[PDB]
């Protein structure tokens, strides 16, 4: 159902007595705004409201036993919440006061949003696989989906930019509420009487990200200390999400930790199909010691291609399982796994770590 602001509301029952309510801001992710504003906004989103301060809201939520989180994705900014079914009228209201009338106080920008954002960026980039994936996105999609998922000092962000990116975003058309374990009529009533109905019907100056414009064949290299990594990225149209998913499930994927898969036989290797609204990225990554990774990535490439279609067929059911597991409420997916052949000749390549040992794209 929807309200006059064109906010999409979806609600379905859940296995447990646990209401999982998420607000997905369609294009407030790292793709839309200036590089990193989405991450800083995700930090700010719960740190004050017109209705409630941060301290009061956090204390009341913990008293209520619920959990609130704000995760930034390239497509959308997701505000997750998980609370007992009894506490729905509270949290929905809170989320209203989060989407609108968020204070954006500088004393929080300098204290709780820059330190936290920098700490998260350092922690994530410490893993060479994640750094390689970010670079691979940056080179496969030069703008939009290529924007780094986290804030970086290389692109300074002023608080006014974050505040102006909260406004002209966060429009009724641009958000969707998704609830597991909540009645759609009750959630609709609460949203209607919440702050959401004060949102602009349509953003006056929405970013309106330009077409994806996938660029294939590019390679990059990111020197780094510690563990090394090597990643191969195939851009894919949405209609191909099925094919590659099956291919991933055929060779082995992070979403499906399972030995005996072709890719698992080489240490540190895993594949995953990042799915987005208008484009996707099939990533084959190997991590660990540089000398081991050098041969591991070549073996992983040789495994991704030359996979028999007969063997690919059995992977259809595993691909359906993987899609269902990834179908978590915050990121719903409708992917028709089809098992057709998936080309790999158009790969991008990115190496991280001991660049002296890791191979170049011409070596595959």
């Amino acid at each position: 159902s929807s309200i006059p602001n064109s906010v999409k509301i979806a609600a379905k029952e859940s296995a447990t007595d646990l209401t999982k309510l998420s607000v997905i801001i369609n294009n407030a992710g790292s793709k839309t705004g200036k590089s990193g504003v989405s991450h800083l906004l995700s930090k700010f989103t719960f740190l004050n409201n017109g209705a409630k301060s941060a301290l009061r809201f956090t204390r009341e939520s913990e008293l209520l036993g619920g959990t609130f989180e704000s995760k930034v994705t390239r497509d959308a900014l997701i505000l997750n919440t998980t609370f007992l079914k009894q506490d729905l009228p509270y949290y929905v209201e809170a989320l209203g006061n989060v989407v609108s009338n968020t204070q954006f106080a500088p004393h929080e920008f300098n204290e709780i949003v820059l330190p936290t954002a920098n700490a998260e960026t350092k922690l994530a980039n410490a893993n060479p696989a994640f750094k390689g994936v970010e670079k691979l996105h940056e080179i496969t999609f030069r703008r939009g989906l290529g924007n780094p998922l986290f804030y970086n000092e290389s692109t300074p962000i002023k608080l006014e930019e974050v505040a102006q990116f909260s406004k002209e975003q966060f429009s009724g058309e641009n958000i969707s509420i998704v609830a597991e374990g909540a009645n759609e009529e009750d959630l609709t009533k609460f949203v209607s009487e919440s702050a959401f109905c004060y949102l602009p019907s349509s953003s006056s100056n929405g970013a309106k990200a330009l077409p994806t414009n996938t660029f294939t064949g590019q390679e990059a290299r990111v020197p780094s200390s510690g563990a090394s990594s090597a990643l191969i990225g195939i851009p894919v149209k949405p209609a191909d999400f099925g094919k590659y998913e099956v291919l991933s499930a055929a060779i082995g994927t992070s979403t499906l930790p399972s030995t005996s898969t072709p890719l698992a036989q080489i240490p540190g290797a895993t594949s995953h199909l990042y799915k987005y609204q208008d484009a996707g990225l099939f990533v084959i990554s190997v991590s660990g010691e540089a000398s081991q990774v050098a041969q591991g990535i070549k073996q992983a490439k040789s495994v991704a291609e030359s996979v028999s279609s007969s063997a690919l067929s059995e992977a259809v059911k595993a691909a359906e399982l993987s899609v269902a597991l990834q179908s978590t409420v915050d990121s719903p997916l409708n992917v028709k796994v089809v098992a057709e052949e998936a080309p790999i000749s158009k790969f991008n390549y990115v190496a991280v770590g001991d660049l002296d040992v890791l191979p170049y794209a011409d070596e595959l």
Binding site: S53, L55, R56, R59, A105, P106, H107, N110, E111
Partner: protein, 122 residues
């Protein structure tokens, strides 16, 4: 010692009634003028006792330009007291520049502290 919130509440309690504002405001202005801090280049907020966690937090959250101006004012006041000389009326802080710049930050810190105390006391 007295919370800045309490003094602001009392000041608004008075100011809301012209019956008492018309009597005290002239007296308050004369008292501040005679207080002698303006002639040293200081604003009211500079006199506030910094050595308090709330006050330290409020100062830390102060904008860069205001913080630097406050540092210069404090240094000038220290130099004047050290040299036993005062700024003339031309260089003195005019009444209209006593902008109470630091009060909002102190009040924000006080509100945070009071919310913490109220929430953890239940």
């Amino acid at each position: 010692v007295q919370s800045m919130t309490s003094v602001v509440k009392a000041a608004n309690f008075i100011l809301a009634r012209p019956t008492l504002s018309k009597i005290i405001t002239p007296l308050a202005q004369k008292f501040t003028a005679y207080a002698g801090y303006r002639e040293m280049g200081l604003k009211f907020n500079d006199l506030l006792l910094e050595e308090t966690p709330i006050m330290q937090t409020a100062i830390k959250r102060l904008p860069s330009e205001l913080n630097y101006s406050r540092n210069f004012r404090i240094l000038t006041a220290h130099q004047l007291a050290l040299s036993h000389q005062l700024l003339p009326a031309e260089k003195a802080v005019k009444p209209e520049e006593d902008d109470n710049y630091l009060i909002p930050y102190i009040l924000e810190a006080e509100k945070e502290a009071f919310e913490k105390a109220e929430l953890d006391n239940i």
